[PDB]
Amino acid sequence: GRSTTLMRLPKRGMQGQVPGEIKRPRYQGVNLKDLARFEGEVTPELLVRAGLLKKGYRLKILGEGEAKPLKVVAHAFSKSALEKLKAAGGEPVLLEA
Amino acid sequence: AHKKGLGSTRNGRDSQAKRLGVKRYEGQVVRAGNILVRQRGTRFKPGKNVGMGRDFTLFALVDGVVEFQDRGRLGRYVHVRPLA
Amino acid sequence: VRIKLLLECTECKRRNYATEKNKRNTPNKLELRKYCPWCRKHTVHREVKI
Amino acid sequence: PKMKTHKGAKKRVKITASGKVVAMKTGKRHLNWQKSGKEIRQKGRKFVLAKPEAERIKLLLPYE
RNA sequence: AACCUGGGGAACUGAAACAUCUCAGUACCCAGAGGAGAGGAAAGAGAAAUCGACUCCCUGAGUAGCGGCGAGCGAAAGGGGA
RNA sequence: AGCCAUGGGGGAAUCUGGGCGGACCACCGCCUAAGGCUAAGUACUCCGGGUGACCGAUAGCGCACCAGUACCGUGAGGGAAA
RNA sequence: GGCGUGCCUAUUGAAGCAUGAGCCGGCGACUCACGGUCGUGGGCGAGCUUAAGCCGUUGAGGCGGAGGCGUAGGGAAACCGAG
RNA sequence: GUAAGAGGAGGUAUAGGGAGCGACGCUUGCCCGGUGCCGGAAGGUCAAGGGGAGGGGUGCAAGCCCCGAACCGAAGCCCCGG
RNA sequence: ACCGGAGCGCUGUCUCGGCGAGGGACCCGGUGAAAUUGAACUGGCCGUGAAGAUGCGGCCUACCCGUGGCAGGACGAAAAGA
RNA sequence: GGGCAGUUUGACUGGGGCGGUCGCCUCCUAAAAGGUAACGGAGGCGCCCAAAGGUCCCCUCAGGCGGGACGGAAAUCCGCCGGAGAGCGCAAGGGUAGAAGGGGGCCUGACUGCGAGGCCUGCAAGCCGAGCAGGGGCGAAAGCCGGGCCUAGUGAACCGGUGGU
Numbered sequence A: 001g002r003s004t005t006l007m008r009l010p011k012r013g014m015q016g017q018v019p020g021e022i023k024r025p026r027y028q029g030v031n032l033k034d035l036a037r038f039e040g041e042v043t044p045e046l047l048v049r050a051g052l053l054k055k056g057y058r059l060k061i062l063g064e065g066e067a068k069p070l071k072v073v074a075h076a077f078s079k080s081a082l083e084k085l086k087a088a089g090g091e092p093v094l095l096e097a
Numbered sequence B: 001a002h003k004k005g006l007g008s009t010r011n012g013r014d015s016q017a018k019r020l021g022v023k024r025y026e027g028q029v030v031r032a033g034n035i036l037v038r039q040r041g042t043r044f045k046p047g048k049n050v051g052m053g054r055d056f057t058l059f060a061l062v063d064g065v066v067e068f069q070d071r072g073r074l075g076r077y078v079h080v081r082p083l084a
Numbered sequence C: 001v002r003i004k005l006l007l008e009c010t011e012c013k014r015r016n017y018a019t020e021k022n023k024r025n026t027p028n029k030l031e032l033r034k035y036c037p038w039c040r041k042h043t044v045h046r047e048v049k050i
Numbered sequence D: 001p002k003m004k005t006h007k008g009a010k011k012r013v014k015i016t017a018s019g020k021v022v023a024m025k026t027g028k029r030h031l032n033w034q035k036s037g038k039e040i041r042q043k044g045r046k047f048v049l050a051k052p053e054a055e056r057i058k059l060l061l062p063y064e
Numbered sequence E: 001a002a003c004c005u006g007g008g009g010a011a012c013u014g015a016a017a018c019a020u021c022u023c024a025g026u027a028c029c030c031a032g033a034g035g036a037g038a039g040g041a042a043a044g045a046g047a048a049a050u051c052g053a054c055u056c057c058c059u060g061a062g063u064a065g066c067g068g069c070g071a072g073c074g075a076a077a078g079g080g081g082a
Numbered sequence F: 001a002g003c004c005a006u007g008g009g010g011g012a013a014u015c016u017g018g019g020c021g022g023a024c025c026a027c028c029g030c031c032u033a034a035g036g037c038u039a040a041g042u043a044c045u046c047c048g049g050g051u052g053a054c055c056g057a058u059a060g061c062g063c064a065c066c067a068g069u070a071c072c073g074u075g076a077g078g079g080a081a082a
Numbered sequence G: 001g002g003c004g005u006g007c008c009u010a011u012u013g014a015a016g017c018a019u020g021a022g023c024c025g026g027c028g029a030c031u032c033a034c035g036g037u038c039g040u041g042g043g044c045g046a047g048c049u050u051a052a053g054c055c056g057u058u059g060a061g062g063c064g065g066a067g068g069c070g071u072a073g074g075g076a077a078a079c080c081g082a083g
Numbered sequence H: 001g002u003a004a005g006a007g008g009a010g011g012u013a014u015a016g017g018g019a020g021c022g023a024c025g026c027u028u029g030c031c032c033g034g035u036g037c038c039g040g041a042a043g044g045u046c047a048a049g050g051g052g053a054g055g056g057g058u059g060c061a062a063g064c065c066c067c068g069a070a071c072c073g074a075a076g077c078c079c080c081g082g
Numbered sequence I: 001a002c003c004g005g006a007g008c009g010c011u012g013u014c015u016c017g018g019c020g021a022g023g024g025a026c027c028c029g030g031u032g033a034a035a036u037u038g039a040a041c042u043g044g045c046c047g048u049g050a051a052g053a054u055g056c057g058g059c060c061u062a063c064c065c066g067u068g069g070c071a072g073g074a075c076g077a078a079a080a081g082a
Numbered sequence J: 001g002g003g004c005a006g007u008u009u010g011a012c013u014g015g016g017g018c019g020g021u022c023g024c025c026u027c028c029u030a031a032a033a034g035g036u037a038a039c040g041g042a043g044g045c046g047c048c049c050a051a052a053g054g055u056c057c058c059c060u061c062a063g064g065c066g067g068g069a070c071g072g073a074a075a076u077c078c079g080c081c082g083g084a085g086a087g088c089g090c091a092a093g094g095g096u097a098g099a100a101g102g103g104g105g106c107c108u109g110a111c112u113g114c115g116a117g118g119c120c121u122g123c124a125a126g127c128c129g130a131g132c133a134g135g136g137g138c139g140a141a142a143g144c145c146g147g148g149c150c151u152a153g154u155g156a157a158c159c160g161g162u163g164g165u
Helices: A033-037 A044-048 A079-084 D007-012 D037-042 D052-059
Strands: A029-031 A060-062 B035-038 B057-060 B065-071 B075-081 C006-010 C017-021 C046-048 D014-016 D020-022
Touching (some): A060 A079, C017 D037, D014 D052
Parallel strands (some): A029 A060
Antiparallel strands (some): B065 B075, C006 C046
């Protein structure tokens, strides 16, 4: 009968408009303990062709685990992720350049 | 049946009575922050390592044991022995 | 309550806030007294608006 | 066919990664003036529980 | 007999009541065209210097939103086929 | 609060005219309106065939049988029994 | 001769002077489709599975990874990230 | 009746529509406060419209779009009496 | 042929009823239905119990089936309380 | 603008109307914790205060009797006995001088960022508070200060105004 516990209030922020919403690229997280298990190099399509991404717009390197030498193909980078690629690992960026 | 007059009233009212009294008795352990007495007046004045606040409440200040006390010319008291 | 009115206090040099109350009947004009700002340190605060 | 998923439901509350429905404290839009900053500070967030289970059934399809 | 294009078109009921909202542009009224209809050569799309007639199925997605921000209502681009 | 179409009034340009990318503008891209036609992919089931972990004469089309027939009703209509 | 207040429904409570049944016969009431949430019998399992449809079959399967769920979450957001 | 028109009426104020009571006889008093109603070339207030002071946004800028002031703005209610 | 009060005549309206007539009702031949129906081997009293009993206790009464006839009851049937 | 249409036109209630009532505070019923009903018994809130708030130095009332210009049971003070019976903003109850009261000085913590652990509890609400950082007010300090002796003085959400990032 009461406010069907509807008395809780919204704070979803911005939460909608009418020109739709912004497509603006998002990032997929990757944990570089999934690195050590994989081998060779890494690339965007390679993860979407894997089982660990698929069309998540772009890719942010991150995560914990064991750092092992190879190269990636990264779209975004955590400070921590830069560090395991300081153990002995490479990385590119943004592409189309 | 004759239902003529009938003297009404203006009385029936009470209170969403909150539950007040000695919340934690003696021999009881507290982790500090546990209130031992919810009272209206000061029927229980602070004890050793027990504090009081705006609503006259004896609560815990440490991790020990509630100890009861009386002092005729000073009032009744509730304390918390250390337990080091 | 209203007609006795309620007011917020505002700093100087632009912004800084709190949430208090007033009273008119006592010959009170510019309600002015100390507080603290979000940024920086102790300041006055002048009576303002709704 | 197909659940409708409630808009308000998602619009004000979230179930954290534990099947725990958590969001908003009630009561601040008309409060104020005689309000101690103590509670405005405690008007930060909340938690909710129990009937929030049914609330987990509400959102359904996307979860969120 | 049904299905189809158009011009008209509700109410119960849903919102636990009722007006906005709803059922629903469904029921019916009519007009007209046929093994079909209508549609159909972008004064479009959408953001990539990417697209390339219209329609149907899957998809996206119950997503983007619309909303006494209630009941609930529910898109297009893109991808796959025809 | 645009785009799409339109009821009253106001009322133009032919490529430095222009419509549009969601108020509005600078800019940057996109498209050529204010004339008319176009198979297929889809839909329907009166109908012809096949098929069914479909029914068995209170079930199954309302009716297997002499049914849109008896009968009822002013009429619209209802509507068997065997 | 020892004993014994029909049935159902409906009740605080029925044998009831509450309720429905003249008798028998046939019919007659917890389905399904989709989306959920949980438990379970399974296959795989850091992954798992395809929708429409192409090909085939006459009671024959296969092909089809487009798409879904899974891997990180936190914030309203930009954005950061086991924080 | 959406209209065209139909009646009223091929009638024309001694006529047609509406209201009250109800043959004939004696008689129908007093209050306009509210309300309805008849009226008034002032006025209070109020719509779209008109006008454009002052201004915003934007762009090199020309320019384009938006906000709206003074006063001008009807019936309506109020107002003056019956 | 509307609603009060009065009187006069008249009278089975009454005292207060008695008789008679026919058509039914009754018996015989022919035809022969309805609503209702939980099942019936269905008595009073005094108690009881959802407060109003054939049925339960207690007592008493009662040879088995009808026909004419009488309506106290079976909370009588009829109307899912106006 | 009832000429016409869709709708609304509460709820409890010793049957309904009628009247009372609808929430919040205190005391009884309330049965030695908690809690508790009833159209049961008695009353209150919809406010207030910039000092009524924080602190530091400081004073102690009511009352009764004894003495007195006005005064006069009662304004005023003198003195003696008097421990809470006065004031404690406003109803009630608890509480109160070993102060909450009453005087002055100073001030504005009627802070911000939080907040362990609790009271209470169908949810949602409400209620308790050390502590920690900031940067302050009082006091030499010790220290308290995140309003008020305590419990009434109140209103989820949606809507939108407001200054601002």
